[PDB]
Amino acid sequence: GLPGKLADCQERDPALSELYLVEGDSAGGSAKQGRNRKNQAILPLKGKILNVEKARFDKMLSSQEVATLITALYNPDKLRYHSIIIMTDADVDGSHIRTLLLTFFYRQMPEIVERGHVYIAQPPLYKVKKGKQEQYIKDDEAMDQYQISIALDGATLHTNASAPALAGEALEKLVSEYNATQKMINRMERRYPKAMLKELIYQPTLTEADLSDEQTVTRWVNALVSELNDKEQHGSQWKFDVHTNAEQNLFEPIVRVRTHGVDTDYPLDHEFITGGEYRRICTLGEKLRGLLEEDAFIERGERRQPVASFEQALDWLVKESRRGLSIQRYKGLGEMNPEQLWETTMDPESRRMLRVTVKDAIAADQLFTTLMGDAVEPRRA
Amino acid sequence: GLPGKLADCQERDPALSELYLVEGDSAGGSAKQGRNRKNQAILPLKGKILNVEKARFDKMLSSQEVATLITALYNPDKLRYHSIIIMTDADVDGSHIRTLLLTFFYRQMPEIVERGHVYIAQPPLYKVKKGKQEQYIKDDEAMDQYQISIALDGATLHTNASAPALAGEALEKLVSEYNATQKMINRMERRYPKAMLKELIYQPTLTEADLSDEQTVTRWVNALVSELNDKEQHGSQWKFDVHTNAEQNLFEPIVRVRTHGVDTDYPLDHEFITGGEYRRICTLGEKLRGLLEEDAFIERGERRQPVASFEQALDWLVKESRRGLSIQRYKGLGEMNPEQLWETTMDPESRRMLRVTVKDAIAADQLFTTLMGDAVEPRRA
Amino acid sequence: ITPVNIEEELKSSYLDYAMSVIVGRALPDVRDGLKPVHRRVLYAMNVLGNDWNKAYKKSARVVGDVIGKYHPHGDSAVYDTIVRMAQPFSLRYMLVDGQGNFGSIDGDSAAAMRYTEIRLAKIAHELMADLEKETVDFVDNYDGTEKIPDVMPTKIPNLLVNGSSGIAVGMATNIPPHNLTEVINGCLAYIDDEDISIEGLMEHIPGPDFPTAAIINGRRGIEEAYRTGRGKVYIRARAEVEVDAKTGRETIIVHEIPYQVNKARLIEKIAELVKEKRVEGISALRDESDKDGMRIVIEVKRDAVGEVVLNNLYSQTQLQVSFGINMVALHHGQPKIMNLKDIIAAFVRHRREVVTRRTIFELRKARDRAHILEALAVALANIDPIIELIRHAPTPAEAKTALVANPWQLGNVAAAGDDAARPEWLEPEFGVGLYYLTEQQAQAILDLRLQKLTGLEHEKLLDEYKELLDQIAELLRILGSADRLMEVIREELELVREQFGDKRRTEITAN
Amino acid sequence: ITPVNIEEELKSSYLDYAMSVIVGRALPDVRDGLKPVHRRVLYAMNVLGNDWNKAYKKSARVVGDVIGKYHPHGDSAVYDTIVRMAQPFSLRYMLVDGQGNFGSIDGDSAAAMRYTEIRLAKIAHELMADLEKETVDFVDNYDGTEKIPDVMPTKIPNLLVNGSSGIAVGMATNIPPHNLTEVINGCLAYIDDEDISIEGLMEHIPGPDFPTAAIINGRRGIEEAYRTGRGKVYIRARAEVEVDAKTGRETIIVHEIPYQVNKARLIEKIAELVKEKRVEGISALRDESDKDGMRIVIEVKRDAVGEVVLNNLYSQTQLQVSFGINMVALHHGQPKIMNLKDIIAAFVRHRREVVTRRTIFELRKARDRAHILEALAVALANIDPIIELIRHAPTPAEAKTALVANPWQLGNVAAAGDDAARPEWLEPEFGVGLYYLTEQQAQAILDLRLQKLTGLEHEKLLDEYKELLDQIAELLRILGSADRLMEVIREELELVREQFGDKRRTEITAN
DNA sequence: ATCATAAGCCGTAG
DNA sequence: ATCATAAGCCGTAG
DNA sequence: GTACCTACGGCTTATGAT
DNA sequence: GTACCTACGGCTTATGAT
Ligand SMILES: O=c1ccc2ncc(=O)n3c2n1C[C@H]3CN1CCC(NCc2cc3c(cn2)OCCC3)CC1
C-alpha cells in the first residue's frame, strides 16, 4: 500500500501538501515526470471501483490503499493531506468514475467533506493554434464564443439600409441572437418540419385578428406554399388547406405536404399562435425584415461579396474564418507533454480548482441504486 | 499440474495412449478441437524452458508439470504414456525449443530415450492449389522438384539438332543437371565474379596443353573480353592481360575488369585449371555446345516461341508455369483448420512420425554450453 | 481562484454519462439492427477494399485501422466483437468469413489477433449496397476530420434476423433470431395490405429460429411477446431412449443442446449431481462427439425405466432453460417498446426513402452526362472552323472565350424529349439551327483527343445519347408513379429471397 | 510409417537456429548500421506517406501495418523499438519525432500504444533519399508477395553516429556514439588521401560522444579500441564542492550522471550505503531537479573535507562505470572484427555505387523522354495531312498502321548531339529530311490533345528538348569522369555537414 | 412447511 | 589475505 | 484496467571459500 | 509467453430464516 504506487513529497507536515488521484499507468507517468518534488503527491488507480451501496460489506475490500494511505479509517486523530484533488479525464467514463469516488467519500467520511478538503480539477479541453496565436479552451460554450469572435474580426457590412456601413457590437449582438434562435429552432425541430420554420423568417407577420377575412388567410397561405414549392429542390411538394372549426369562423390554416409516399397535415391553432416560441420567431422575423439586407457588402478583411441571404453571408464568413485554423483536442491526460500538464493543471498561480459543499441531507444517493429511481429519473424530454 | 491444462483420454491403460507437447494458447485450442477423444492427450506449454546444463539446480523448478504428469521422477515403477510425440512449429524458434526439450530428456531420463518412446512430428510446409489440383508439400527440395515437374509438363522442343523433337526424360535430366550446376556456381560466386562464370558456358574449351602457343591464349582471351564488353549493359568494362610466370612460358591469362572506381585482376593458374569445379563447368559447356540449340521451338502446351538462349527459354517456361498457381505457407500450428490439422499430422494412417536413437556417448551436449565450443563450432565456411 | 460549487454537481455528471451510453453504446436501431461498433467495423472493411472474392488479410491491419480512424476505445472489445461474428454457432447468418481457431462450444477462447485471417461474406455486400450514391447522411468522427455513415442502406431486416442483447443504465433488451424466407413473406404480405392483423402476420411467421436446433413447448409466451413486447419461452433439448434388439440395456442419446450452453460445464455439473446422489439411475458417462455431429451417451442404471430419470433431468438439468424475450430499441434516438408491425413499417419506410434518394442521384448524374455529350457532339459536327480558330488563337483562354462568343451553325446531320434533357441550374439562355455554349462545354471540347475522329466514335456517341435519353425517361416515370416504386421493391425482395433462402432448423411442438 | 532416425538430428536443428539468428536478428550492417526491424519500420512509415511537415498519426496504425505486411513477430518488440528511438536521452540523433509520455530517466515506462503520436524527423528523409530510382535491390517478404529494400541508400554513416548493442548466439557487439561534424571531416580527409594513417584519423576524431555529457579519463582504452577493436573506457560524472561565503557548510552538487544509469536506483543505493555506515561523512540527501536541468544536492557531515568522501564515492558509487567497447558487424553476411578505416572505406564504396546507379537510371529516363518528344514535335510539324489521314481512316489501328507505313517530310522549321539522343534498344532503321516512326510514337501522336495547338506549346517543347539535351550531356560527362563523381560526393558531404552540424557535449580530460 | 436473501452468467466497457 | 561462485542489466524474441 | 517468467553474451558487483 | 478485478439488468439457483 504505502510502497509500490504512492510517491510522497519532501515535506511531512500536513495541511501544506497536495494529493492527486488519476488513472494509473497512462497518466501517472506524465504526472510524476511533470509534478513538483516539494509538496506534491500522486496515487494512481486501477480501472474502476465497486459501489458502496449496490454492494455493501464491511468485509468486502480489494484495494483499500486509499484509506490506508489517507487515514486510519476514527478520522479526527490522523489528518494527513488536509488537501486532496481529483484529476480525471474529460470523457464520459471520467465523470462516471468521478461520481463513484464522490459517493464513496460521502458515504464513508462525512467530516472530510464537511470541512472542505475535497477539490475538483478542470483540465483544458481544446488547443487552438492559428500560426503564432495559441489558445487554451476548456468549455463548449467558450469554444463557441471563440469561433464567433474569430468569425467577427471587425467586419463591416454595407447594405442599402439607414446605416451606410453596418458593423460592430450591433452586428455582433444580432448574430448572437440569430444563433440562439437557430438553436431553439433546431431543438423544437423534433415536433414540426423545418421548411416552414425556416420560411417564417422571411414570411410576413401574423395576428389573431386576421381570422376575420378569409382572403387574408388565403393570400398568406398561398404565398407560403408558393415560396415553399419554389425553394423545394428535393423530392417533395406543398399544398394548402383552409378549414373552419368554430360556430362562425375561427379560421385556421392547414398545410398539406407530400413526402416520399405519405402526406401529413399541420394545423394552426390559438395555442400555436400564442406560443412564446412563435412569438420570438415573429419578433426576429420583423427585426430581420426591417433590415433591407438584399444588396449587402461585408468584408473580412481583404475581400467582400454581395449575396441575397444573411445566413449565406454568415456561412461564407464562417468558412473564411475557419479556412486555416488548427485545433487539437486532448481526449486523455496521458496524451499531453509534462510541462503542458504542469502549466495547465497544477500551477498554484494558473490552475482553476473547484470546491465542494454539503448543502442538504437528501435522497439523491438513495435514488442512485434501486433500479426504480434509475427507471424514472431519465425524464429528459 | 494435473488439472488446468492436461486433457487425458478415455483409456487409462498405458502403452496405448498418445501424448503431445505444443505451444499453449494458440495451438492447444485447435489441437483439442481436432484431436480424438479415445486415446489422445495434449499438454500445452508456456514460452521457453530453462536449460539443464547452463543453470543446474535440483531446487530450480518453475513448472515441473511435465515430470509430475509423466512419471514420479525412479522411472521404471510408473510408466504411463509409453508413447510421447513433440509437435513444434517450422520456424527457427521451433527448432530451438525442440533442441532444449531434447537435451532436457537426454540429461534427465536416459532410459525413456533408450527404450524408444520419444517421437518427432513432421508438419507440412506448403499448400499448393492449382484450381482443382491440391498438394501438401513439406520440404524445400520437394517444393523445388514439384515446381520443376509443373514447369516440365510434357513439353516438346524442336531445334535443328539430330533430334527432330527433343523432349522427355532426356530434357528433364538436362534441366536438372543445369540447375545443379547453376546452384554450384551461385555458391562459388562468393569467390569470383559472375560474368566470366556465366560466359564460360558458351566460350570454347581449354586445356593445359594450350600454354605452348601465345596466339591461342591471345585469341581465347580476346574473344572472351569482346563478348563480355558486348554483353555488358551496366556501367563496367573489360580488359585483358597476358603474363609469363615461368622459366620459359607457363602462359597464364589474366583478366582486368574496371568497376565503378577500382580495377581488379583475376589470374588463371594450374590449380584453377585442374579444379573439379572448372572441370564440371567445362563438361557442361561441351555438352551444351554439342546441342546447336539456336533455332529452337518448345511448346507447353498451347504456345511455342523461338529464342536464342536456353536459360531464357527455361525462364519463359517457368513463367508460363507459375502464371496462375496458388501457394499457402503455414507459419504456425495455430493457423490451419482443425480437420486439416487432424488429417495432416495426427491420423494413424496418414501421419509420418520419426524415432530417435541413442547411438553413442559423445560430448556434443558438453560443447553445447561453454562459450568456447559456441565460439568455435560455427565453422560453416 | 476557487469558486464555490454546490454538491448538486453529482446529478449533472451522472445524467450525462447515462444519456451518452443509452444513445451511443448498447441499444441497437430499428432501421438496421446494428450497434455502432459493428457499423464502424463494416465501414472500415469496405473502405479498405476487402471483398469476399479476394485473398484473406491479417486481423492486425483491420484492428489497427479501426482503432486509428473511427473507434478510439482500445482493442480487446473490438477484437472480441470481430471474433463473435465469425462463429457459426452464435449467429444464424454470419457476416465475417474467417479462417483459424475461432473457439468452439467447449468454451475455448480464440487464438491471438496475429494468427487469424478475415474477409467479408457474400451476404455482407447486401448490407452496404449503394453506399456511394448519396443515400444516407455522414457524421464527423471524434476529431472532426472524417465522415461516417449514420445508418446503412440495408436490404435485409437484420434486427429480426439476428437480434442482439445489451444492458444499458436503465434499460435492457433481448431479441431471438428468425428465419429469412418467412420474414420476406411477411414483408410481402404487409406490402400487399397495410392493415393486416397480428393474427395474419403470425400465420406467415410461426416462431423463432436458432443456430442450433431445439424444441419449443409454449405457444402462449411467443404470442404474448409478439403482441405486447414481453414474454417467456422454454427451450428443450432433443433426446430419446434406446434399447438394443437383444438383452443389452437402456441408453440415452443427446443430439443437440439448448442455445448458449457450455458443454464442459454441463458434463461436470451432471457428474457432480450423480456424485451427490441427488439424481438416481445414472451409472457412468461417456462421449462420442466427432466431426459428424455432437453425440453424448449416458448409461442407464440397470432395472430403471429411465424416463422418470429423463424427466428429473429436464426439471433439474440445464437441458431445459428459459429465455427473457424483451423488445427494446431506438426509434428516433429514444427507447420505445415496439412490436412486430412497428418494426416492419419502419423497415418499409427506410427502404422507400433509400430508393427515392438513389433514383434522384442517378437522374442528376445522367442529366449532367447527357448535357456534356450534347456539346461534344455539336463540336464534332463543325470541325474545320474550330481548327482554324484554335490555330489562330495565341492563348488557350482567349480561344475558349472566342468559342463562347460566337454562335454555331448546327449542321443538319447533327440534329429528343420536350424537356428534362437539360440540368436545373442551367439558364434558359443556352440551347435556343441556333445554339450557344458554356465555359464548361468549351473546356470539354478543348479536352478532346484525336482518336475521336474515326467512323466508330460518332455511332458510339449517338448510341450513348439514345441510351441516356431512355434511362432518364424511365427514371422520371419511376419518380412519378408510386406503383412502379412498389413493384421495384417487390421485385428486389423476391430476388433477395430466391438468392438467400434456406430451410428450417428448429421445431415448435405445441405442448 | 516410422523411419528410424539417428540422434544427431540435434546438431542440424540448433545450427540452423544459430545461423538464422546471427544473420537476421541482432548484428547490424557496416553499410548503414541498422537492424532489420528498424529498416522495416522506416520503410513502412515511408510507404504510408508520413513525412515530417504533416500532421501526427496514432501508433496503432503503424504498428498494425508493420505486423501485417513485413514483420510477423508480435507487437511488444516492435512497439518497444519504436519507443526507444523517440527518447532524446537514448540516441545522439533521434529519428522518430513523437508526442506523448515516452518515459524518462527515472525508469518510468511509456504510455500505452493507443495514446502516443509519431512522425518522421527531418534527418530521417536523409536516410531514405532516392529510394524509388532503382538504387538498391528488393527482397521478397515472408510469403513472397511484397518487396523490401535490402540496404538503405543512406547519406550518413549511421553506424559510427549512433551504434548499437546486440547479443547473438556466439558473438556480441557494442559501439559508442560520435559527433557528426568530426566524422564528416574524417571522411573528407580520407577522400583526399587513400593511404591515411590511424594517427591522422585520430587527429580529426578525438573521441566518442554521448547524449548526456560526462568526463572521460583514459586515452589508452579508446586508442587500443580504434586500432584493434577491443578496449575499455571509464565514465566519470561531473560534480564539485561548494562552500558559502559565510559560515554555512560544505555541499556537493551533481549536474549530470553517466550513460544509462537509473537515477532512482542510484538514490536508493546511496541511501542504503549511508544507512549501512559503509560510507562516512554523509548527513542527509535532497533533490532539486526541475525543468531547467538535473540537480542533486548532498549535505556533507560537519567537520569533513568531503573530498575523501567524493573519492570513496567515485570508487564505490555508480558515478564511475566502465564500458566494453567491442566492434563487430556484418561485412558480406559474416561477422568480422573491423576497425575504423574499414568502416570508412565501406561507406565510401557504398556511396559511389549508389551515385553511379542513380545516374544511370536518370540518364535512361531522360533518354526515353527525349525520344518521345522528338516524334511529338515531328508530328506537330506536319498537321494537315495527318488530319486528313485520320479523317479518312475508319479504324484507329489502321490509322496507326498507315502512319507507320509512310515516310514524312520533316519541314525545315522542324530541324543536336552526334549521338546519345536515342535509346539503346532502338534499331538503326529509324530516324535516318527523311524520318520514320514507331508504334509507340504513333500511339503517343494519337494521344495528343487540342491544347497543344497554340503559340506557347511549340516554344515549351523546344525549351524542354534543349534542357534534356543539356542534362543528358552532363550525365554522360559525369559517368565518363571519376573526378567529377568525387567532386559531387564532396559537395554533398559538405552540404550535409553545413545543414546538420552542432557542438560537442562531452569532454575528454586525459588523466 | 413456506418465504426472504444471497450468489453466478450473459456482452461492451474500465 | 587472496580466490572461486553467485547475482543483475543491456535489446529482439517467446 | 493492469505484472511477471523464459533465451542469448559480456560486462559488472557481491559473497563465501582456501 | 500467460490471469484476474470492476459496472450494468434480468433470469436462474442455492441456502438459511420464520
Ligand atoms: O497475458 C497476460 C497475462 C496476464 C496479464 N496481466 C496484466 C496485463 O496487462 N497483461 C497480462 N497479459 C498480457 C497483458 C495484456 N495485454 C493483452 C494484449 C495487448 N496487445 C496490445 C495491442 C496489440 C495490437 C494493437 C493494439 N494493442 O493494435 C495493432 C494490432 C495488435 C497488450 C496487453
Among A194, A203, A151, residue whose Cα is nearest residue A175: A151
Distance from CA of B141 to the nearest CA of D (A): 16
Bridge partners (DSSP) of residue D337 are D328
Given CB atoms, is C11 within the 8 Å cutoff of chain B? no
Which amino acid is residue C21, in one-letter code? V
How far is Cα C65 from Cα C70, in angstroms, rounded to an integer? 8
Do A73 and A64 touch, CB atoms closer than 8 A? no
- Is C326's CB less than 7 Å from nucleic acid strand H? yes
Given CB atoms, is B24 within the 8 Å cutoff of chain C? no
Nucleotide closest to residue D172 (CA–C1'): G9
The CATH number of domain B124-182+276-337 is 3.40.190.10: no
Residues that constitute the known binding site of A for Mg(2+):
23, 89, 91
- Pocket flag, ligand 1, residue D65 (CB < 6 Å): no
Strands, sheet with B166-167, edge to edge from the N-terminal-most edge strand: B166-167, B156-157, B298-299
List the grid coordinates of C68: 486509428
Buried b (16+ CB within 10 A) or exposed e, B156-172: ebbbeeeeeebbeeebe
Question: For chain D, how long is the longest CA-to-CA vector?
Answer: 113
How far is Cα D50 from Cα D69, in angstroms, rounded to an integer? 17
How far is Cα C343 from Cα C34, in angstroms, rounded to an integer? 14
Question: Mutual orientation of helices C340-381 and C482-500 as an angle, nearest 10°?
Answer: 110
Q: Calculate the angstrom distance between C1' of H15 and CA of A45.
A: 37
List the grid coordinates of C492: 428486389
DSSP secondary structure letters along C83-152: HHHH-GGG-SS--EEEES----TT-PPP--TTT-EEEE-TTHHHHSTT-SSS-S-EEE-TTSSSEEESS-
Count the neighbouring beta carbons within 10 Å of the beta carbon of residue A23: 21
Question: Mutual orientation of helices D36-48 and D59-69 as an angle, nearest 10°?
Answer: 110
How far is Cα A361 from Cα A106, in angstroms, rounded to an integer? 11
CA C33, C36, C37, C40 dihedral sign is positive
Q: Answer yes or no: do B33 and C108 touch at CB < 8 A.
A: yes
CATH topology of domain B183-274: Ubiquitin-like (UB roll) (3.10.20)
Q: Chain F bases under 7 Å from protein CB?
A: 10-14
Residues with Cβ within 8 Å of D90's Cβ and at least 6 positions away in sequence, in order, are: D84, D211
Ligand 1 centroid, distance to C76 Cα (angstroms) = 8
Among C307, C294, C308, residue whose Cα is nearest residue C257: C294
Name the residue facing D390 among C114, C446, C453 (closest C-beta).
C453
Total beta-carbon pairs less than 8 A apart between chain A and chain C: 79
Looking at residue B324, what DSSP letter applies?
T
Given CB atoms, is D409 within the 8 Å cutoff of chain A? no
Ligand 1 centroid, distance to C75 Cα (angstroms) = 9
Ligand 1 centroid, distance to C146 Cα (angstroms) = 28
Do B360 and D10 touch, CB atoms closer than 8 A? no
Q: Answer yes or no: do B32 and C106 touch at CB < 8 A.
A: yes
Given CB atoms, is C332 within the 8 Å cutoff of chain A? yes
Bridge partners (DSSP) of residue D4 are B355
How far is Cα A115 from Cα D163, in angstroms, rounded to an integer? 59
Looking at residue B355, what DSSP letter applies?
B
Bridge partners (DSSP) of residue B241 are B254
SS3 C402: helix
* G7 closest protein residue (CA to C1'): B48
Distance from CA of B232 to the nearest CA of C (A): 41
- Pocket flag, ligand 1, residue D58 (CB < 6 Å): no
Helix (H) or strand (E) holding A328, with range, is: strand A326-329
Residue B58 among the catalytic residues = no
Distance from CA of A352 to the nearest CA of C (A): 6
Buried b (16+ CB within 10 A) or exposed e, A88-119: bbbebebbbbbbbbbbbbbeebeebbeeebbb
Nucleotide closest to residue D164 (CA–C1'): F11
Question: Mutual orientation of helices C340-381 and C457-480 as an angle, nearest 10°?
Answer: 150
Name the method of structure determination.
Answer: cryo-EM
How far is Cα B220 from Cα B282, in angstroms, rounded to an integer? 15
Spacing of C-alpha D360 from chain mean position? 23
Q: Answer yes or no: do A120 and C360 touch at CB < 8 A.
A: no
Residue to mutate (ligand 1; options D71, D75, D79, D109; most atoms within 8 A of CB): D75
Looking at residue B77, what DSSP letter applies?
T
Distance from CA of A149 to the nearest CA of D (A): 26
Which residue minimizes the CA distance to atom 31 of ligand 1? C60
Q: Answer yes or no: do C115 and B335 touch at CB < 8 A.
A: yes
Residue to mutate (ligand 1; options C41, C58, C63, C75; most atoms within 8 A of CB): C75
- Pocket flag, ligand 1, residue C218 (CB < 6 Å): no
Helix (H) or strand (E) holding C389, with range, is: helix C384-392
Report how many domains make up chain C: 1
Burial (Cβ within 10 Å: 0-12, 13-18, ≥19) of residue D273: middle
How far is Cα D168 from Cα D26, in angstroms, rounded to an integer? 6
What are the CA-CA distances from residue B201 to residues A256, B204, B239 (Å)?
Answer: 93, 8, 20
Q: Answer yes or no: do C15 and A377 touch at CB < 8 A.
A: yes
Bridge partners (DSSP) of residue D149 are D138
Q: Which of B105, B356, B376 to mutate to test the interface with D (most CBs of D within 10 A)?
A: B356
Name the residue facing B26 among C115, C287, C288 (closest C-beta).
C115
How far is Cα A125 from Cα A143, in angstroms, rounded to an integer? 9
What are the CA-CA distances from residue A150 to residues A137, A155, A301, A322 (Å)?
Answer: 14, 10, 12, 9
Residue span of the structural domain in which D172 resides:
1-511
How far is Cα D32 from Cα C98, in angstroms, rounded to an integer? 41
How far is Cα C196 from Cα C190, in angstroms, rounded to an integer? 7
Among A160, A129, A124, residue whose Cα is nearest residue A142: A124
Given CB atoms, is D390 within the 8 Å cutoff of chain C? yes
**Vertex A274: Cα angle to A273 and A277 (nearest 5):** 90
SS3 D476: helix
Q: Give me the torsion for CA of B168, B174, B177, B178, rounded to 10°.
A: -130
Catalytic residues of A: 23, 89, 91, 93
Given CB atoms, is D161 within the 8 Å cutoff of chain B? no
How far is Cα C360 from Cα A234, in angstroms, rounded to an integer? 9
List the grid coordinates of C196: 393486416
- Pocket flag, ligand 1, residue D191 (CB < 6 Å): no
Q: Calculate the angstrom distance between C1' of H10 and CA of C169.
A: 13
Closest chain A CA to residue C171: A375
Q: Answer yes or no: do C68 and D61 touch at CB < 8 A.
A: yes
Which amino acid is residue C369, in one-letter code? R
Count the neighbouring beta carbons within 10 Å of the beta carbon of residue B235: 15
Domain(s) of CATH 3.30.300.370: residues in chain B? 124-182+276-337
Q: Which entry of D14, D17, D43, D115 is annotated as an active-site residue?
A: D115
Domain(s) of CATH 3.10.20.690: residues in chain A? 183-274
How far is Cα D413 from Cα A111, in angstroms, rounded to an integer? 102
Count the neighbouring beta carbons within 10 Å of the beta carbon of residue B134: 10
Given CB atoms, is A328 within the 8 Å cutoff of chain D? no
Q: How many residues does chain A have?
A: 381
Spacing of C-alpha B98 from chain mean position? 19
Among C99, C119, C60, residue whose Cα is nearest residue B336: C99
Residues with Cβ within 8 Å of A159's Cβ and at least 6 positions away in sequence, in order, are: A166, A291, A292, A293, A294, A295, A296, A297
Name the residue facing D482 among B261, B359, B364 (closest C-beta).
B261
